[PDB]
Scaffold this active site. Structure first.
Site, mmCIF file in Angstrom:
data_model
loop_
_atom_site.group_PDB
_atom_site.id
_atom_site.type_symbol
_atom_site.label_atom_id
_atom_site.label_comp_id
_atom_site.label_asym_id
_atom_site.label_seq_id
_atom_site.Cartn_x
_atom_site.Cartn_y
_atom_site.Cartn_z
ATOM 1 N N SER B 39 5.259 -49.204 32.272
ATOM 2 C CA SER B 39 4.894 -50.608 32.087
ATOM 3 C C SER B 39 3.450 -50.668 31.588
ATOM 4 O O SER B 39 2.517 -51.057 32.294
ATOM 5 C CB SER B 39 5.079 -51.389 33.381
ATOM 6 O OG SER B 39 4.184 -50.936 34.382
ATOM 7 N N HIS B 157 11.843 -50.858 34.615
ATOM 8 C CA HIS B 157 12.429 -49.523 34.615
ATOM 9 C C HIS B 157 13.329 -49.280 35.823
ATOM 10 O O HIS B 157 13.455 -48.141 36.285
ATOM 11 C CB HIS B 157 11.334 -48.459 34.546
ATOM 12 C CG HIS B 157 10.647 -48.388 33.218
ATOM 13 N ND1 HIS B 157 9.766 -49.355 32.783
ATOM 14 C CD2 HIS B 157 10.717 -47.469 32.226
ATOM 15 C CE1 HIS B 157 9.320 -49.032 31.582
ATOM 16 N NE2 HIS B 157 9.881 -47.893 31.222
ATOM 17 N N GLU B 166 6.990 -52.800 42.421
ATOM 18 C CA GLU B 166 6.724 -51.816 43.462
ATOM 19 C C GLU B 166 6.437 -52.488 44.798
ATOM 20 O O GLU B 166 5.803 -53.546 44.855
ATOM 21 C CB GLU B 166 5.542 -50.922 43.076
ATOM 22 C CG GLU B 166 5.728 -50.176 41.767
ATOM 23 C CD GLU B 166 4.472 -49.449 41.327
ATOM 24 O OE1 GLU B 166 4.318 -49.206 40.111
ATOM 25 O OE2 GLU B 166 3.635 -49.128 42.197
ATOM 26 N N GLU B 209 9.199 -42.765 40.528
ATOM 27 C CA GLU B 209 8.101 -42.445 41.431
ATOM 28 C C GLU B 209 8.587 -41.933 42.784
ATOM 29 O O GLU B 209 7.810 -41.895 43.742
ATOM 30 C CB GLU B 209 7.204 -43.668 41.622
ATOM 31 C CG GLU B 209 6.609 -44.207 40.334
ATOM 32 C CD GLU B 209 5.941 -45.555 40.522
ATOM 33 O OE1 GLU B 209 5.879 -46.331 39.546
ATOM 34 O OE2 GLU B 209 5.485 -45.841 41.650
ATOM 35 N N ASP B 244 2.986 -53.976 43.729
ATOM 36 C CA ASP B 244 2.662 -53.984 42.304
ATOM 37 C C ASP B 244 3.706 -54.873 41.636
ATOM 38 O O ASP B 244 4.779 -54.412 41.244
ATOM 39 C CB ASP B 244 2.647 -52.576 41.704
ATOM 40 C CG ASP B 244 2.348 -52.579 40.210
ATOM 41 O OD1 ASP B 244 1.840 -53.601 39.704
ATOM 42 O OD2 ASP B 244 2.612 -51.557 39.540
ATOM 43 N N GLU B 292 -0.916 -56.381 43.190
ATOM 44 C CA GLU B 292 -1.355 -55.884 41.895
ATOM 45 C C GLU B 292 -0.595 -56.600 40.787
ATOM 46 O O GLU B 292 0.634 -56.723 40.853
ATOM 47 C CB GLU B 292 -1.138 -54.374 41.799
ATOM 48 C CG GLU B 292 -1.344 -53.790 40.418
ATOM 49 C CD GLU B 292 -0.902 -52.345 40.344
ATOM 50 O OE1 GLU B 292 -1.000 -51.641 41.371
ATOM 51 O OE2 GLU B 292 -0.440 -51.915 39.267
ATOM 52 N N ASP B 317 -4.362 -54.458 36.939
ATOM 53 C CA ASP B 317 -3.775 -53.265 36.337
ATOM 54 C C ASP B 317 -3.679 -53.432 34.824
ATOM 55 O O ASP B 317 -4.531 -52.927 34.085
ATOM 56 C CB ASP B 317 -2.400 -52.991 36.954
ATOM 57 C CG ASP B 317 -1.709 -51.777 36.355
ATOM 58 O OD1 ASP B 317 -0.479 -51.647 36.544
ATOM 59 O OD2 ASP B 317 -2.388 -50.949 35.709
ATOM 60 N N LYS B 342 -6.968 -45.977 35.984
ATOM 61 C CA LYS B 342 -6.066 -45.089 35.261
ATOM 62 C C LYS B 342 -6.847 -44.456 34.120
ATOM 63 O O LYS B 342 -7.320 -45.161 33.222
ATOM 64 C CB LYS B 342 -4.842 -45.843 34.733
ATOM 65 C CG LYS B 342 -3.911 -46.353 35.825
ATOM 66 C CD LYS B 342 -2.783 -47.192 35.247
ATOM 67 C CE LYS B 342 -1.795 -47.610 36.322
ATOM 68 N NZ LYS B 342 -0.710 -48.474 35.780
ATOM 69 N N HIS B 370 -1.714 -43.402 39.445
ATOM 70 C CA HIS B 370 -0.924 -42.511 38.617
ATOM 71 C C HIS B 370 -0.201 -43.325 37.550
ATOM 72 O O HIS B 370 -0.342 -44.547 37.458
ATOM 73 C CB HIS B 370 0.078 -41.740 39.476
ATOM 74 C CG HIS B 370 1.119 -42.611 40.111
ATOM 75 N ND1 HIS B 370 2.364 -42.143 40.472
ATOM 76 C CD2 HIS B 370 1.098 -43.921 40.455
ATOM 77 C CE1 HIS B 370 3.066 -43.127 41.004
ATOM 78 N NE2 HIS B 370 2.319 -44.216 41.008
ATOM 79 N N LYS B 393 -2.966 -44.674 44.943
ATOM 80 C CA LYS B 393 -1.513 -44.732 44.906
ATOM 81 C C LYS B 393 -1.025 -43.767 43.835
ATOM 82 O O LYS B 393 -1.471 -43.827 42.684
ATOM 83 C CB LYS B 393 -1.002 -46.157 44.647
ATOM 84 C CG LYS B 393 -1.352 -46.756 43.296
ATOM 85 C CD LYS B 393 -0.407 -47.897 42.962
ATOM 86 C CE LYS B 393 -0.398 -48.191 41.474
ATOM 87 N NZ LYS B 393 0.659 -49.178 41.119
HETATM 88 C C1 LIG Z 1 4.827 -48.408 36.420
HETATM 89 C C2 LIG Z 1 3.358 -48.027 36.503
HETATM 90 P P1 LIG Z 1 2.825 -47.369 34.779
HETATM 91 O O1 LIG Z 1 3.854 -46.304 34.380
HETATM 92 O O2 LIG Z 1 1.420 -46.804 35.016
HETATM 93 O O3 LIG Z 1 2.863 -48.627 33.904
HETATM 94 C C3 LIG Z 1 3.156 -46.876 37.527
HETATM 95 C C4 LIG Z 1 1.911 -47.272 38.398
HETATM 96 O O4 LIG Z 1 2.304 -47.378 39.758
HETATM 97 N N1 LIG Z 1 1.683 -48.646 38.024
HETATM 98 O O5 LIG Z 1 0.728 -49.422 38.702
HETATM 99 C C5 LIG Z 1 2.532 -49.056 36.932
HETATM 100 O O6 LIG Z 1 2.356 -50.247 36.585
HETATM 101 MG MG LIG Z 2 1.135 -51.584 37.971
#
Ligand SMILES: C[C@]1(P(=O)(O)O)C[C@H](O)N(O)C1=O
Ligand SMILES: [Mg+2]
Ligand SMILES: C[C@]1(P(=O)(O)O)C[C@H](O)N(O)C1=O
Ligand SMILES: [Mg+2]
Lengths: 433, 433
Positions: B39, B157, B166, B209, B244, B292, B317, B342, B370, B393
């Site tokens: 994402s 996803h 999340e 994850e 998230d 988030e 994010d 990130k 990550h 995380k």
């Molecule tokens: C899905 C993810 P990315 O693959 O980095 O877009 C994983 C991470 O946990 N995060 O914050 C996201 O938004």
């Molecule tokens: Mg995120």
């Protein structure tokens, strides 16, 4: 030579504790971790578990870690043996443990120290890990193996009704190992879309090894799924199929239950000869070139009866559990023609090389294997190249506990250069190259 | 100072190519790999893919690898700069790339060389990597972070009908970090049994994850599963909940669609006022302490309004993408109060530290993060400790691409030993400790 051996507890790919071992020589630090199986054979060496039902639900390894730091570590440091003396250091550990199945110190504690010794010995001889393993095994013609990616999941640890455990792909028509990585990954992604387009969006989540476990029941339907993605990706003749049946998981009263996760009804049980006739159909209708654990770990009559009437590869997993005693019995009885190599089943690097040497002396194939609970350790990658076996299965091209081995095998291949040779269609007898 | 820089193509945790970099100094070999998001925000630094659908569906990184070997490697080597010159070498690559979004060499190319310089720079200083990053960021009081394990999966996803991406657990009430790993693993395995009963055996396979994606629709229903697993594990006291949302993935015509995976329908759309009013219920009815991406990456009016009306941690994010310029607008707009760090969003270790200090010097918490596509590299483990952010995380306690960080974070706590501190309930601003 050994300045310090220190062990700790880390979480494997399943979230369960496992033994990590740090070994310090004058040349630096050497780290190794021990895998852990899920559907185990009752004949392998003891995996030392704590049993503390209120700490990791009894799956901690504090007792095996303690045997290292308090007993095995000071005893190996006091030896005066160099880290290059893999056999002498492994023997001394087998002496201190004393038990047959390594029940005193645990196989994970002994293997963790044994794995780090072999890594430290490679540096003392100023050799890469795979070359040092080859000199230990008496080999010199290294070869890159054919990877077998477990892409369809069934059996005891799959939420489906599919009885057989693993349906794998073997890119035998690849140009190199890095070429085999691309073929296995593209077919894995192609299979992901086919499963999503026939079983829903919620059927693409991966299992312990990274493969998909759709809700199917007929085993031939899984083979048709694999062959469907193999042709759709355009590798119809460059990728074949291997199988880990794990038939011990549904051995009911001397028969076999291809629906053992359904309510137990003994009317559906089939005989060993019926199960073999099903394998024969899988061979004639699908490009199945290898079948692992086709019968029970103690049904030697069915193993010998089937191997004598098939021309494909028969891989012993729970039948031989990397045990030289049970391998000799299968060699004498002709129960199978391939040996699955799991270092944690036997518990030491020396014994694992001895088990591989024994099979190769009798014309057997050898396939280095992973466990369901793997770590970030990449030892078996250098092991399969050092032993010149020709075939390794260590998961699907998904989850990094599987790809750290696949990536390392690509670093090993690039490092070998012109010297490197890919087994290809000779994954059974790579020595003819 | 740099003897050789050589890059290759490996596979990340999802089977997609990514950039790995080897950097050789007089002190040995240094290796680092670059992650890849799923994402992904629009304002991220450019990840250069090949687009050659003859290999890996056009997801190769041969172009980015070639830019390292052919251009970036001989540039840093001929520059004569020491590997400890992290900022001088990073600025050398930024001016060489000469592009704002790093769309000339690709961010995955610059970062892999940058991650390998920081690893080689730590050995020249004879310091562990986290100590070098602590000195690169002007820190001195290392703090071990509170881990956030993603256990329930939704979003773009996922195969379920769950809108928010999340749902995480943070063992803030743990004694140490090694104890935080035990609490998160116990709840994760407890949750696997809870989901197994309410949703069946087929709903226990893991996602990208390591978390589960059970077929649920309501986002309050996911918080009921997490809170039930927290209580059924006996840790109702010590574990809180983070989320998230990734609301940018269901931003539809200025409104928000909490069912974007179902066939589209504007009647279901809600406003940021409605969406913010829903978050007020999640904060009260459940121990939700951090959220988030509660709104889209461009709805600055909804960020600034909700943040000034709640007391929980608001994480940016896709809104800030570790970019000092987009973070700088967020500190004036008061859009959030936590930076999700990130490294591949911005593309370099030097810039990732600048963006981190811009948050910490404005009263923001920082959570190292990550990506969905990860490797066996554990750089961010030494990064969250060196920057003293107090929270990271990096996935569920499943799949070794996630455990590789948590294992290294466990070895760092042990290595620091007597002087090791755990963020505990001070995970938002650990500077008090
Ligand atoms: C899905 C993810 P990315 O693959 O980095 O877009 C994983 C991470 O946990 N995060 O914050 C996201 O938004
Ligand atoms: Mg995120
Ligand atoms: C299920 C497994 P283990 O975990 O080793 O018991 C996985 C491996 O693929 N294999 O051959 C098996 O039998
Ligand atoms: Mg098997």
């Amino acid at each position: 030579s050994i300045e310090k051996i220190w062990a700790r507890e880390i979480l494997d790919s399943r979230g369960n504790p496992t033994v990590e071992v740090d070994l310090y020589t004058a040349k630096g630090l050497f780290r190794a971790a021990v895998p852990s199986g899920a559907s185990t054979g009752i004949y392998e060496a003891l995996e030392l578990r704590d049993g503390d039902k209120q700490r990791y639900l009894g799956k901690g390894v504090l007792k095996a870690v303690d045997h290292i730091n308090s007993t095995i570590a000071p005893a190996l440091i006091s030896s005066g043996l160099s880290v290059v003396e893999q056999e002498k250091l492994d023997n001394l550990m087998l002496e201190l443990d004393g038990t047959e199945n390594k029940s005193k110190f645990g196989a994970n504690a002994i293997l963790g120290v044994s794995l780090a010794v072999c890594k430290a010995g490679a540096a003392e001889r100023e050799l890469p890990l795979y070359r040092h393993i080859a000199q230990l095994a008496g080999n010199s013609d290294l070869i890159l193996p054919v990877p077998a990616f477990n892409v369809i999941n069934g059996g005891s640890h799959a939420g489906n009704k599919l009885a057989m455990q693993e349906f794998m792909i073997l890119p035998v028509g690849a140009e190199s190992f890095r070429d085999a990585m691309r073929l296995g990954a593209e077919v894995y992604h192609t299979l992901k879309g086919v499963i999503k387009d026939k079983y829903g969006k919620d059927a693409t989540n991966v299992g312990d090894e990274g493969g998909f476990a759709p809700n199917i029941l007929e085993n031939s339907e899984a083979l048709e799924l694999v062959k469907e993605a193999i042709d759709k990706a355009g590798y119809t003749e460059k990728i074949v199929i291997g199988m880990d049946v794990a038939a011990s998981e549904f051995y009911r009263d001397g028969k076999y239950d291809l629906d053992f996760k359904s309510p137990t009804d003994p009317s559906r049980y089939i005989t060993g000869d019926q199960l073999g006739a099903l394998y024969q159909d899988f061979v004639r209708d699908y490009p199945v070139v290898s079948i692992e654990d086709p019968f029970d770990q103690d049904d030697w009559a069915a193993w010998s009866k089937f191997t004598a009437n098939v021309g494909i590869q028969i891989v012993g997993d729970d039948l031989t559990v990397t045990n030289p005693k049970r391998i000799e019995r299968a060699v004498e009885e002709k129960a199978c023609n391939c040996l699955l190599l799991k270092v944690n089943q036997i518990g030491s690097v020396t014994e694992a090389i001895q088990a591989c040497k024994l099979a190769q002396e009798n014309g057997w194939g050898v396939m280095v294997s992973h466990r369901s609970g793997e770590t970030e350790d990449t030892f078996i990658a250098d092991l399969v190249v050092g032993l010149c076996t020709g075939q390794i299965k260590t998961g699907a091209p998904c989850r990094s506990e599987r790809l750290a081995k696949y990536n390392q095998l690509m670093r090993i291949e690039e490092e070998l250069g012109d010297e490197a040779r890919f087994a290809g269609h000779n994954f059974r007898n790579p020595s003819v190259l």
